[PDB]
Point group: C4
Amino acid sequence: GSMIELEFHDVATFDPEVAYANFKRVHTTGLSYDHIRIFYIKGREIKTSLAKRSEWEVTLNLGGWKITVYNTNFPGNRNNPVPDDGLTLHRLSGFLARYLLEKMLKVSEPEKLIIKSKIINPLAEKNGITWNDGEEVYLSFFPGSEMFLGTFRFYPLAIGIYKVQRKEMEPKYLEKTMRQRYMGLEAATWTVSKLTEVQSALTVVSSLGWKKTNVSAAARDFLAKFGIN
Amino acid sequence: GSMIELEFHDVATFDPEVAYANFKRVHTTGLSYDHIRIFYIKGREIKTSLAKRSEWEVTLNLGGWKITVYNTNFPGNRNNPVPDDGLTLHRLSGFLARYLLEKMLKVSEPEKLIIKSKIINPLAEKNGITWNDGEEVYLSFFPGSEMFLGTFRFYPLAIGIYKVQRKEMEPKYLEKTMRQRYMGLEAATWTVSKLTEVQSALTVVSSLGWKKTNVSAAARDFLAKFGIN
Amino acid sequence: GSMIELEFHDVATFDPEVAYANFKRVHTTGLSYDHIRIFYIKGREIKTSLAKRSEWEVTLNLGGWKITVYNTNFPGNRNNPVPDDGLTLHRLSGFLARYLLEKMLKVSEPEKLIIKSKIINPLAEKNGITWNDGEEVYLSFFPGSEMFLGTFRFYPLAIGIYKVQRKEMEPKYLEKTMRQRYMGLEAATWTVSKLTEVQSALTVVSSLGWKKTNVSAAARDFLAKFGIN
Amino acid sequence: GSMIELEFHDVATFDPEVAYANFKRVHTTGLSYDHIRIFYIKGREIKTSLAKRSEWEVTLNLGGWKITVYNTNFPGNRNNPVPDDGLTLHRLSGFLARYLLEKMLKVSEPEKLIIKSKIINPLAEKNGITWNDGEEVYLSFFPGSEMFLGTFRFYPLAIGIYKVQRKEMEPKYLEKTMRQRYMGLEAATWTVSKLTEVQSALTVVSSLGWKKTNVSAAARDFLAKFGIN
RNA sequence: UUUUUUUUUUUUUUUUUUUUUUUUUUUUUUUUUUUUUUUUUUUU
């Protein structure tokens, strides 16, 4: 027979605005609102199909649009460094959410209606929140939005906080959010410096009214009459 | 080595009475009460064996009777469109429950006794409910019955509501029921229009007395004397 | 390609004392207390190793002793009829527990000490119960003992009842016990006829003092001083 | 076909200080603080990678350092005797924790700073405890430390007790600790003989302040203001 | 009357967790989308 020897060795950065800058410059040239809605709608499937394949670098063909992404989803590929100028599924989702929010402020009133028609946010909709509830809010439901707490005016965090305190999400999912800048301010500084910003941001989200299930309006009420969620 | 590219593209109906009509016309010619009892009794196994095979279209041989069914049970086959004139295991179960309830009203008093002897409803029996408790009630325990809330006089819904409020079933399983017609009325209209119908329907089901376990009568009581379910 | 057809068909007894009789006659000729202690001690492993193999009929070689058992443990083999004169791992365990209890009453006082030294009951010991606590009690911890509630004077049931009411076991595991005879009496008759028998039987078991963990005597107490089980 | 026979047979020690002695003599010749930090940091991965391979005896190459370990982690390999002079992952972790604590008492004040810089204890750090909180405490977080309750002055036990009573760990994980010596004293003797030692040991650990999550200081407080852990 | 739970011993055997503005992963993903997901009778 035989005897294996397995080896190990010692060990011992990234900001979003520059990674976003670079992305916008290179990639968003040949890109359209149809290409984006594809990405967000099929986000569910794209995550799984990537988690199956073992190939470290994979390309997505979203309609016409095509991007190369580091497949950090596959179990084996996790926890191996990703370049500061690299794209993961997560970062991509965040960038695109920024990209849209920018358009949604600098573009034509009829053009805005093309966005609100085409682009659907699975996670916001499931929880009974639509474009109508606020363009900055709706888009901050997209994962990756927390990279830009500045741009999204603390809603990524507010949405999280509202979910943990109503038992929906676990405390550990707010970890990444808390290691993030606000405008320029670092974690501890803004934690109280801008506490009242977050206070109001939560106030906004708390009014919106989540959706436990994907049901009717009358259903919500009707079922509740016998003791329901 | 290699590097995969995987692609995606955009996206963007069915009523039971017509699907049932068509089914009854074509399929229930060479069919018998023995063929049905087979389907419902071995329903457990039929679901699993279908969930194993990957073949999108499969045929069932229930004694003499033979049907072709779209195998929507297999994990890979889920969420790919099923024709409005197509059969799934679920729809089949519902149709057959309608079919029986129709017979049970338009047939001979000795013929009814052939039904009550032969046809067994696993789910109703497990929960300590028998034919004696009402032919419309017993049959509405079969999955698919919710497609015809009219035909079954709101019992499919009542049974569900009684189960969630006593913690047995999860809230999300009443979703499909709530997207369904009643006679002609749509969800929101009947939700209150026919609220008192459902009120009484629940009253009926609540009297019947479920069975936590598959035990004796004396057992129920005896065990309870030491602090039991 | 292809298209599968899978088929199904209709469907539509055992007493322990005769199955035990037959077993004792044929099998317990070339058998010893060493052979038994093997069976009970390695019961853990014997269950698993049988659950791996797919062979419907398997033989056990317990030291010298050798028996043929229907491998009803393997997932695929479950729920296919077992002859009334057949042996399963469960039945075997029950029979051997009867067999011992019989010896333990009809044999020499020094011979009894050979039993109490050699034969160990994993499940009774884990729960801090030994031979000292009663030969009829200790042996009724062996699975299969419930087949002979008569022989074991309601302890199989008492032990169960004591476990569910202290949250250790789930209610459904008392199902099999309740479909069993007592002397000659059937379920409902003895349920109250002999209620006071069971009352006292529980009284006995409740005094014995279970063991949450496999720890010391001082440990029990010591750890408890900081708020412990 | 075929028909299997599977066989079984009857059945019917170790002190740490001698196993440690032997280890220190033979193995810690060509060994360095860099080699150790590797072992503890990658402990997570080393456990899994060993649990995959089925080879009963495996060697670790921790930087330069190389050891042979009995792979008792692999499911199949569990519960087959390990020599009293043998190494398991667990024992190794304990020995190395002793080894360090010894150095940390008998070495130069600048040399101590090399240790505190290089060697990281994943489990202590996760729970917000650092070298600063006490060299004997920090090191007793390493698994295996309970073999030497003497050397570590009851902290291995105190840490456990503090965790079960605050619901973090399950009661059964204190089993191994309780079957262990203290100086020379056996379980029951020291359980009260040295009760006040453990009392103070717990007092120490209870002051240290655990960390539910891996978050900031301001985060701890900030999140708590909306009802948080 | 088949299975599922739990299977002794200062047996020292496994099972729980495993750091670092680690920016990696883990949670959950739109439409009266009618698609799956839940349970499945009897001295079984």
